Amino acid sequence: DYAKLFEQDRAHFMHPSTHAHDHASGALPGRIITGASGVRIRDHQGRELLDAFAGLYCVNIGYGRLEVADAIHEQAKQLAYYHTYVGHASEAIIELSARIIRDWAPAGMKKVYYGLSGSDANETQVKLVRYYNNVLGRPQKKKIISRQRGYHGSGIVTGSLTGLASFHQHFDLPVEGVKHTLCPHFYKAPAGMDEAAFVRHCAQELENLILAEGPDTVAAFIGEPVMGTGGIIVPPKGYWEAIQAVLAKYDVLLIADEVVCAFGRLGDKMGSQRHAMRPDLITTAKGLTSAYAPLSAVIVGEKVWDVIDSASTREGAMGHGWTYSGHPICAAAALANLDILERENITANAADVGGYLNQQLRQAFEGHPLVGEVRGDGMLAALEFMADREARTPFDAALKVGPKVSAACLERGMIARAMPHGDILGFAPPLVLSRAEADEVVGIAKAAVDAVAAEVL
Amino acid sequence: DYAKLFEQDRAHFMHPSTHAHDHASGALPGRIITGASGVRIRDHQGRELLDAFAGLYCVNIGYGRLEVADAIHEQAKQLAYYHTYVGHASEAIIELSARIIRDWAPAGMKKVYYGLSGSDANETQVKLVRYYNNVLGRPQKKKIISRQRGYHGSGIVTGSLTGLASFHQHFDLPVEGVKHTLCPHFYKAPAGMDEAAFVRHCAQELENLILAEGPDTVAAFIGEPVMGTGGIIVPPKGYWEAIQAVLAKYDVLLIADEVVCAFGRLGDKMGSQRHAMRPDLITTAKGLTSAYAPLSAVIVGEKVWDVIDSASTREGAMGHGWTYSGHPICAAAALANLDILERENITANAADVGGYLNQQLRQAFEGHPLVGEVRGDGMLAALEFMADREARTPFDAALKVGPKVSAACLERGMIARAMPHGDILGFAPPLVLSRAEADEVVGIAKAAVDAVAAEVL
Ligand SMILES: *Cc1c(COP(=O)(O)O)cnc(C)c1O
Ligand SMILES: *Cc1c(COP(=O)(O)O)cnc(C)c1O
Ligand SMILES: [Cl-]
Ligand SMILES: [Cl-]
C-alpha cells in the first residue's frame, strides 16, 4: 500500500473505533494490511505482526485459509445470493443450521436465525424476548438485565445492554428497560469476601434488582460466559449456578452471549457447556466463520421456539427479517470453517495451548510489580496493571498504562489489545496457536511490560 | 436439492419473514434456489423463474456475475479479513469510499461508515444524530420523525422508524422518541385535494407535529426518496421541497434512506439527486453490492462530519464499531459491482427500461376493473388492487387479493412480490432488464391479474 490510498482514507473513510480528527489529520497513522498467514498479518510497510488477538477474537482457524476462500468462491459462482424469506433457502444455510444444532450448540437448542453481526443477533434476541412474553399474555414482562462491563454490541438497544461507558457516551444510553447488575470480578470484590461470599453477594444483588424492578416486569438476563471486551473476566466458582438459581426463581430467560466464546474459543464447543450455563437463547458470530465472511446466528432453545411456532398459527409470520439473512457465501464460509475446526481438532488445541498460555503468563507475570492480576480461561487471557497491587488501587486512567503496553508490544512485532476502561492487556490468539507461538507471545509481552514499568514506576 | 435438506430446514432453520409453524409442518413449502443467471433464478425442481424483484430490490446488476465472484475470491485469497478499528484498512475499503463519494453520492457528502445491513446503517444514523446534538450542547434535540408506511429496518429502533405494523407487532414498537407523519400517497389524499393542496397538507401536518413535540426536541427526519416496502409510493410533485422547507425552518436533519433507491435504481445515481433531496446523512445497502456480498454504508455529509471531527478532539474516539465494519471481501464485491454499473451504463438502462416498464404497465392496467392505481418511478413499479376504484375503497385484507396475484404470477413463472398492508403487486427487477424482458413481465402480470379478477369479482 500507498500514499494516495492513505490520502483517500483520511478524506473519505469513517473507521469504526477511530479518533475522527487524529486519523483525518494523520496524527493517528493509518495502517493497511496487505496479507496474512497462520497467526501473522503483513502491513503496508512489509512488517509481519504476530496477532495475539486474532483480529477481534475472531480469526480462530488462523489466516490465509485457501480452503475457505475456495468455498466462498464456489458458492459465489453457483449462487452468490438469493433471499431466505417465505421458506426460501440455499443448501449451505440448511446444512449449517443442522450442524450448529447437532455438533456445537448445547442440549435443548432447536432453531437458528441468521444475521450479519453479533449486534444484530442481540437485537434479534430482544425482539424474541418481547414477542415471547407478548404472545404468552405477559405484556409487562419486558425488562432485560445485563452487567457492568458486559459487551453486547454497538447499537442503541445493544449498546444499552453493553455495560461499558464508551459505548454510551453521547448516545443517551442505556435506554429504559435495560438495567445492569455487578461485574463478577473477584479480584475487585469488597474487602473481606472470599470467593464463595462474593458469589453469594452477586446473586443477592441480582435478586434485589429483580425485586426492586418487580419480577413480573423482568424478562431476561444476558451474559457472556467469560466477559471479553470488558476485560477477560472469568466467572467465579459457582457464579453461573448462583445466577441461574435466581433467574429460575423469577422465570427470567437466560441469553448466553457467545459471540466470543463459541466455536472452540474456551477449549469447549461453547462457553455454556464449559461454564454450566443452560441458556434459553444463544448469540453467536466472530468464530462462526472465523471472520472469513460476515455472519451471526441466534440459536433458539426448544422452549422459546415452541411458543414462536404455536403463536404463528394465530399471529401470522413474525415481523422479522434482514435482507441478507442466510447469505449463501457467508454460509459456505461457515461450513468450511466448521470443517476445519473439526478436522484439525482445534477445540482440543485451544484447551491445551490455552491452558499453557495462561500458565506461562502466570509464570512470567505473577508478582510483577506493574501487574495486579493475571487471568484467563481457554484461549483468552489478560494482565491487569495496577498502582497498588494489594490495595487494588488502579493507575489513573490518564497515565494510559494499558495503551502504552499494547503499543510497546506492537513495536516488538506483536498485536495484543489494550482493553477499554482500565489498564488491561488482552490476548485472544487464533485457536491454532502452538505452544511455541504462545511462548513467543509471553516473551514479547514480558519485554513490553518491562519497558513500560521502567517508564511509569 | 433434496428431501433430507427440507427435513433439516423445517427442523432447524428459522427463516426471516416466514410463518414459523406452517413452514415447520410443511404447509408452507420450502424452496431451494440452486443457481441463477441474468434475470432468472433456478429452483430445486429445475423451474426457471423470471425474477422481477431482483431478490429484494438488490440483485441490480443481474445474477451469475463471474466477475464479482472472482473479485470476492481474489480478496478472500489475499486477505479475507482484518479489522478497520484504530485506523486500519484494506486497499478495497479505501477505494470504495473514494468512489462512492466521487461517483455516486450527492454534493456535499464526505465520509463513509460501513456495516452489513441497511438496518445497522440506520442504527448508526440514530447514534450519529444523538452524538451530533449532544456534542453541540443540545441534549433535548433527539426525536426522530419518520412516516407511516416508511420502511427502515427490522430492529427495535429501526423497526420503530419503520411505519408498517407487521414490524411492530409484539415488539412494543414504536419506542419513545420516534414519531410518524403522513404517508404522502396522493391517490389516497383527502377528497377534494388536488396534488398541490395535498403537498401543502403534508407539510402543515409535519409542521404541526414538530410544533406539538417542541422543535427544540426534534433532531431528524428520515425518508426513502420513493417508499419501497411501503408499496412503491412516489413522492408527489413538490413534496420533497415542501418537507425540506419545514425541516430547515426548525433545524431538523434529513436522513435519506437510499437502501433501495441508491446505485441506479431510479435511473439516477441515487434517489436524492432525482427527487431534489439534499440530505445531511444517507443510508445505503442492497444495490451497493447487488447483494453479491453483504454491505451497508452510511454516507456522512460535511456538516455532520465536521462536528464529529471537531468533537473527537475533546471527546476521544467515538464509541461505535461493528467487528465486520469494512469487511474486505464485501468491499471487493462492491467495487466489482460499481465497475459493472459504470461500464455497462446500467443507470441509463434503468432510466430507459424503467420508463418503458411503467408505461407498459399503465397501458395494460389503467382502467382494469381490479386495479385502483398503477404507479412507479425508474425501475420500481406497483399495481394496487381496489374494490371500488373511484371511491378508493380497498378489498378487505382477508380476501388476500395481493398475495393471490403474486401467487398467480409465480404459477406462471415470474416473481413479483405482494407488498405488506394492502393489495399491492410490486416490481423491482434487475437494472439490466431489457425492454423485451419488461414486456414479458407485464404479459405475465396481466395474465395473473386477469386470473385473480375472474375469481374475486
Ligand atoms: C463483538 C461482540 C458482539 C457484537 O458483535 P459485532 O459483530 O461487532 O456486532 C456482541 N457480543 C460480544 C460478547 C462480542 O464480543
Ligand atoms: C431493506 C431496507 C432496509 C433494511 O435493510 P436490511 O439489509 O434488510 O437491514 C432499510 N431501508 C430501506 C428503505 C430498505 O428497503
Ligand atoms: Cl476437538
Ligand atoms: Cl449510466
Q: What does the alpha-carbon distance between residue A46 and residue A51 come to, in Å, rounded to a whole number?
A: 15
Q: What does the alpha-carbon distance between residue B357 and residue A283 come to, in Å, rounded to a whole number?
A: 44
Residues of B in contact with A38 (CB under 8 A): none
Cα R_g (chain A), whole angstroms? 22
DSSP A33-68: EEEEEBTEEEETTS-EEEETTHHHHT-TT-B--HHH
Sequence-separated (6 or more) residues with CB below 8 Å from residue B45: none
Structural element, H or E, at residue B313: helix B302-315
Q: What does the alpha-carbon distance between residue A66 and residue B187 come to, in Å, rounded to a whole number?
A: 56
Structural element, H or E, at residue B178: strand B178-181
* Residue B261 DSSP symbol: T
Query: Would you state the cell numbers that stand for residue A444, as one nine-digit string?
Result: 514479547
Per DSSP (E only), the strands in A224-304 are: 253-257, 281-284, 296-301
Cα B36 from chain centroid (whole Å): 22
Alpha helices (runs of H) in B151-238, residue ranges in sequence order: 157-161, 195-213
Cell numbers 413538490 correspond to B238
Q: Whose CA is nearest to atom 11 of ligand 1?
A: A152
* Ligand 3 centroid to residue B130 C-alpha, Å: 46
**Closest ligand to the CA of B347:** 4
> Considering Cα of A38, then A40, then A44, then A47, what sign does the dihedral take?
negative
* Ligand 1 centroid to residue A259 C-alpha, Å: 6
My answer on whether B133 and B212 are in the same domain is: yes
Cα A184 from chain centroid (whole Å): 17
Q: Which residues pair with A283 in a beta bridge?
A: A257, A298
- Considering only CA atoms, which of A53, A223, A213 is closest in space to residue A122? A223
Residue B43, burial from CB neighbour count under 10 angstroms (0-12, 13-18, 19+): middle
Alpha helices (runs of H) in B136-183, residue ranges in sequence order: 157-161
Amino acid at the residue A1? D
Contact A112 B13 (CB under 8 A): yes
Per the structure, how many domains does chain A have? 2
Chosen domain end from B343, B363, B387: B343
Contact in structure between B283 and B116 (CB atoms under 8 Å): no
- Considering only CA atoms, which of A143, A122, A142, A145 is closest in space to residue A134? A142
Q: Which residues pair with B223 in a beta bridge?
A: B256
Residue to mutate among A1, A10, A17, A283, with most B CBs inside 10 A, is: A17
My answer on whether A320 and A192 are in the same domain is: yes
End-to-end Cα separation, chain B, in angstroms: 39
Helix (H, G, I), strand (E, B) or coil at B268: coil
Chosen domain end from B343, B362, B378: B343
Residues of A in contact with B45 (CB under 8 A): none
Contact B291 A323 (CB under 8 A): yes
Name the closest residue on chain A to residue B41, using Cα atoms.
Answer: A82
Cα B406 from chain centroid (whole Å): 19
Nearest ligand 1 atom to alpha carbon A229 = 15
Query: Would you state the cell numbers that stand for residue A101, as one nine-digit string?
Result: 444444532
**Shortest distance, CA B43 to any CA of chain A (angstroms):** 10
Contact in structure between B86 and B450 (CB atoms under 8 Å): no
Query: How far is CA B370 from each of CA B52, B374, B391, B457, rounded to the nearest angstrom?
Result: 21, 11, 13, 8
Minimal Cβ distance to A73: which of B19, B72, B168:
B72
Q: What does the alpha-carbon distance between residue B116 and residue B118 come to, in Å, rounded to a whole number?
A: 7
Query: How far is CA A201 from each of CA A211, A234, B126, rounded to the nearest angstrom?
Result: 15, 16, 38
Helix (H, G, I), strand (E, B) or coil at A126: helix
**Shortest distance, CA B263 to any CA of chain A (angstroms):** 17
* Ligand 2 centroid to residue A319 C-alpha, Å: 14
- Considering only CA atoms, which of B257, B248, B244, B252 is closest in space to residue B162? B257
- Considering only CA atoms, which of A418, A412, A417 is closest in space to residue A443? A412
- Considering only CA atoms, which of B159, B200, B157, B156 is closest in space to residue B182? B200
Sequence-separated (6 or more) residues with CB below 8 Å from residue A143: A177, A178, A179, A213, A217, A218, A219
Amino acid at the residue A422? G
**Shortest distance, CA A200 to any CA of chain B (angstroms):** 34
Residue B24: how many CA atoms within 13 Å on its side-chain side? 20
Query: Would you state the cell numbers that stand for residue B86, as one nine-digit string?
Result: 484504530
Residue to mutate among B6, B12, B305, with most A CBs inside 10 A, is: B12
Q: What does the alpha-carbon distance between residue B116 and residue B284 come to, in Å, rounded to a whole number?
A: 10
My answer on whether A44 and A78 are in the same domain is: no
Pocket test for ligand 2, best of B286, B289, B380 (most atoms within 8 A of CB): B286
Contact B88 A322 (CB under 8 A): no
Nearest ligand 2 atom to alpha carbon A322 = 8
Helix (H, G, I), strand (E, B) or coil at B189: coil
Sequence-separated (6 or more) residues with CB below 8 Å from residue B69: A73, A76, A77, A80, B292
My answer on whether B245 and B314 are in the same domain is: yes
Q: What does the alpha-carbon distance between residue B267 and residue B289 come to, in Å, rounded to a whole number?
A: 17
* Ligand 4 centroid to residue B413 C-alpha, Å: 30
Contact in structure between B346 and B370 (CB atoms under 8 Å): no
Contact A18 B87 (CB under 8 A): yes
Q: Are strands A296-301 and A281-284 parallel, antiparallel or unpaired?
A: antiparallel
* Residue A455 DSSP symbol: H
End-to-end Cα separation, chain A, in angstroms: 39
The CATH number for B392's domain is: 3.90.1150.10
* Ligand 1 centroid to residue B116 C-alpha, Å: 13
Residues of B in contact with A228 (CB under 8 A): none
Q: What does the alpha-carbon distance between residue A149 and residue A391 come to, in Å, rounded to a whole number?
A: 21
Residue B310, burial from CB neighbour count under 10 angstroms (0-12, 13-18, 19+): middle
- Considering only CA atoms, which of A338, A326, A253 is closest in space to residue A289? A338
Contact in structure between B338 and B53 (CB atoms under 8 Å): no
Buried-exposed string B406-427: b where 16+ CB fall within 10 A, e elsewhere: bebbbeeebbbbbbbbbbbbbb
Q: What angle do CA A327, A307, B399 make, to 5 degrees?
A: 75
Q: What does the alpha-carbon distance between residue A353 and residue A355 come to, in Å, rounded to a whole number?
A: 5
Query: How far is CA B55 from each of CA A184, A223, A294, B290, B291, rounded to the nearest angstrom?
Result: 46, 36, 19, 9, 8
Contact B323 A56 (CB under 8 A): yes
My answer on whether A197 and A322 are in the same domain is: yes
DSSP A296-360: EEEEEEHHHHHHHHHHHHHH-S-S---TTTT-HHHHHHHHHHHHHHHHTTHHHHHHHHHHHHHHH
Contact in structure between A403 and A318 (CB atoms under 8 Å): no
Nearest ligand 2 atom to alpha carbon B261 = 13
Residues of B in contact with A23 (CB under 8 A): 87
Q: What does the alpha-carbon distance between residue A444 and residue A40 come to, in Å, rounded to a whole number?
A: 14
**Shortest distance, CA A235 to any CA of chain B (angstroms):** 24
My answer on whether B246 and B294 are in the same domain is: yes
Residue B455, burial from CB neighbour count under 10 angstroms (0-12, 13-18, 19+): exposed
Sequence-separated (6 or more) residues with CB below 8 Å from residue B249: B207
Contact in structure between A281 and A112 (CB atoms under 8 Å): no
Contact A68 B76 (CB under 8 A): yes
Name the closest residue on chain B to residue A323, using Cα atoms.
Answer: B56
**Closest ligand to the CA of A426:** 1
Contact in structure between A71 and A336 (CB atoms under 8 Å): yes
Query: How far is CA B407 from each of CA A18, B56, B449, rounded to the nearest angstrom?
Result: 49, 17, 10
Helix (H, G, I), strand (E, B) or coil at B161: helix
Q: What does the alpha-carbon distance between residue A372 and residue A350 come to, in Å, rounded to a whole number?
A: 25
Give the Cβ contact number of residue B345 at 10 Å.
12
My answer on whether A28 and A107 are in the same domain is: no
Amino acid at the residue A407? A
- Considering only CA atoms, which of B209, B208, B199 is closest in space to residue B243? B199
Structural element, H or E, at residue B405: helix B401-411
Contact in structure between B76 and A292 (CB atoms under 8 Å): yes
> Considering Cα of A336, then A340, then A343, then A347, what sign does the dihedral take?
negative
Q: Omega of the bond prior to B174 within 30 degrees of 0, cis?
A: yes
Contact A291 B86 (CB under 8 A): no
- Considering only CA atoms, which of A171, A170, A174 is closest in space to residue A161? A174
* Ligand 3 centroid to residue A39 C-alpha, Å: 19
Cell numbers 403474486 correspond to B406
Contact B85 A317 (CB under 8 A): no
Q: What does the alpha-carbon distance between residue A300 and residue A281 come to, in Å, rounded to a whole number?
A: 5
My answer on whether B72 and B213 are in the same domain is: yes
Give the Cβ contact number of residue A393 at 10 Å.
11
Alpha helices (runs of H) in B145-297, residue ranges in sequence order: 157-161, 195-213, 239-249, 271-274
Cα R_g (chain B), whole angstroms? 22
Pocket test for ligand 1, best of A144, A260, A324 (most atoms within 8 A of CB): A260
Residues of B in contact with A6 (CB under 8 A): 94
Query: Would you state the cell numbers that stand for residue B281, as one nine-digit string?
Result: 446523512
Contact in structure between A225 and A277 (CB atoms under 8 Å): yes
My answer on whether A23 and A36 are in the same domain is: yes
Structural element, H or E, at residue A42: strand A40-43
**Shortest distance, CA A192 to any CA of chain B (angstroms):** 36
Minimal Cβ distance to A156: which of B100, B126, B315:
B126
Residue to mutate among B2, B4, B8, B14, with most A CBs inside 10 A, is: B14
Query: Would you state the cell numbers that stand for residue B240, as one nine-digit string?
Result: 420533497
* Residue B190 DSSP symbol: P
Q: Which residues pair with B109 in a beta bridge?
A: B301
Domain that holds residue B423: 1-64+344-457
My answer on whether A125 and A253 are in the same domain is: yes
Cα A10 from chain centroid (whole Å): 29
Q: Which residues pair with B301 in a beta bridge?
A: B109
Residue to mutate among A324, A327, A330, A415, with most B CBs inside 10 A, is: A324
What is the edge-to-edge ordering of all strands in the sheet holding B48-51? A88-89, B31-37, B40-43, B48-51, B414-415
Sequence-separated (6 or more) residues with CB below 8 Å from residue A396: none
Cα A449 from chain centroid (whole Å): 25
Helix (H, G, I), strand (E, B) or coil at A402: helix
Helix (H, G, I), strand (E, B) or coil at B89: strand
* Residue B393 DSSP symbol: B
DSSP B338-390: HHHHHHTTHHHHHHHHHHHHHHHHHHHHTT-TTEEEEEEETTEEEEEE-SBTT
Per DSSP (E only), the strands in A128-204 are: 143-147, 178-181
Structural element, H or E, at residue B31: strand B31-37
Name the closest residue on chain B to residue A165, using Cα atoms.
Answer: B319
Q: What does the alpha-carbon distance between residue B55 and residue A81 come to, in Å, rounded to a whole number?
A: 8
* Ligand 4 centroid to residue B345 C-alpha, Å: 3
Nearest ligand 1 atom to alpha carbon B325 = 8
The CATH number for A194's domain is: 3.40.640.10
* Residue A227 DSSP symbol: B
Contact in structure between B378 and B274 (CB atoms under 8 Å): yes
Query: Would you state the cell numbers that stand for residue A131, as one nine-digit string?
Result: 414477542
Chosen domain end from A310, A343, A376: A343
Q: What does the alpha-carbon distance between residue A92 and residue A391 come to, in Å, rounded to a whole number?
A: 54
Q: What does the alpha-carbon distance between residue A412 and residue A148 come to, in Å, rounded to a whole number?
A: 33
**Shortest distance, CA A413 to any CA of chain B (angstroms):** 16
Q: Name residues contacting ligand 1 (CB within 6 A).
A: A 117-119, 151-153, 224, 228-229, 257, 259-260, 285; B 322-324
* Residue A163 DSSP symbol: -
Q: Are strands A48-51 and B143-147 parallel, antiparallel or unpaired?
A: unpaired
My answer on whether B95 and B110 are in the same domain is: yes
Residue B140, burial from CB neighbour count under 10 angstroms (0-12, 13-18, 19+): exposed
Minimal Cβ distance to B117: which of A110, A116, A312:
A116
Q: Are strands A109-115 and A296-301 parallel, antiparallel or unpaired?
A: antiparallel
Sequence-separated (6 or more) residues with CB below 8 Å from residue A212: none
My answer on whether B424 and B296 are in the same domain is: no
Q: What angle do CA A400, A405, A407 make, to 5 degrees?
A: 95
Sequence-separated (6 or more) residues with CB below 8 Å from residue A295: A114, A115, A116, A285, A288, A289, A327, A330, A331, A333, A334
- Considering only CA atoms, which of A59, A32, A56 is closest in space to residue A46? A32
* Ligand 2 centroid to residue B117 C-alpha, Å: 7
Residue A257, burial from CB neighbour count under 10 angstroms (0-12, 13-18, 19+): buried
Ion ligand 4: residues, CB < 5 A: B 345, 347-348
